[PDB]
């Protein structure tokens, strides 16, 4: 068997709708609240009719 450990992170300022962040200490692990559909860097667009 194999084992790995990696972990992911969100860019601070990813959301970038936020005046100032809550709590001052905020998990950079992606989640529903901060990381779902809120990340400014990436914009997804479904194409149809091809």
């Amino acid at each position: 068997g194999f084992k790995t450990r990696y972990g992911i992170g969100i860019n601070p300022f990813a959301e970038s709708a936020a005046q100032a962040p809550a709590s001052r200490i905020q998990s950079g692990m992606p989640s529903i609240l901060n990381s779902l559909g809120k990340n400014a860097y990436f914009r997804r667009v479904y194409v149809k009719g091809i």
Partner: protein, 51 residues
């Protein structure tokens, strides 16, 4: 990441005499323009909010 659990700071430029306050506008924000008169008239008088 060599040690578990990295961390990254963030420096907001916040204005209004309270770097931390409820709804203290952020200074240099790509979204949000700088409040037009803050240095200016907005220090002399307080304008009525619009609702």
């Amino acid at each position: 990441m060599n040690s578990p659990t990295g961390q990254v700071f963030a420096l907001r430029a916040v204005y209004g005499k309270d770097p931390v306050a409820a709804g203290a506008k952020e200074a240099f924000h790509p979204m949000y323009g700088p409040d037009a008169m803050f240095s200016g008239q907005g220090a002399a008088k307080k304008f009525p909010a619009l609702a």
